[PDB]
Amino acid sequence: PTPESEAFLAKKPQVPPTFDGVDYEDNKRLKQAQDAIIREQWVQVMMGRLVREELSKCYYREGVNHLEKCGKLRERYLQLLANAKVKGYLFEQQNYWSKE
């Protein structure tokens, strides 16, 4: 794919976007978990931004029959719109969800 930029190594998270198994009194590990979650939520919203830019070019390209040519892009944008918001880490940091 597109090469990973030099600016995209300095700010790339080194930790998974989670708080499970993170000692809070280790401030270094804690702030990086905060950063990891915020960066993921933001990649998700810019993923929808880019799909929306493609939708627009399919709209101005297909004109009248965009209703039968731009449906795949419409799916992806509507999926992302329901799932990506920047909600922060504060709720995530302060609650644990067992997933069981």
Partner: protein, 72 residues
């Protein structure tokens, strides 16, 4: 029969000239000068915004899908 242009800018009558009150020096050289120098510097400020970082990752995820074409 249009009239001559008229008026006193800064209230300075046609005889005399504008008298510098004191503020003018620092405000034109320091206050405004700092903003032009800040403006020219701001052009070379590296872009550390979250979006320039999030767009490039987002493109690499959608490139892994038919949504965005990859140059490779």
């Amino acid at each position: 029969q249009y009239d001559p242009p008229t008026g006193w800018l800064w209230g300075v009558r046609p005889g005399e000239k504008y008298q510098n009150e004191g503020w003018e020096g620092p405000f034109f050289y320091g206050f405004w000068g700092s903003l032009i120098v800040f403006a020219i510097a701001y052009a070379y400020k590296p872009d550390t915004s979250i979006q320039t970082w999030a767009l490039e990752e987002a493109r690499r995820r959608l490139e892994a899908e038919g949504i965005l074409e990859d140059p490779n």
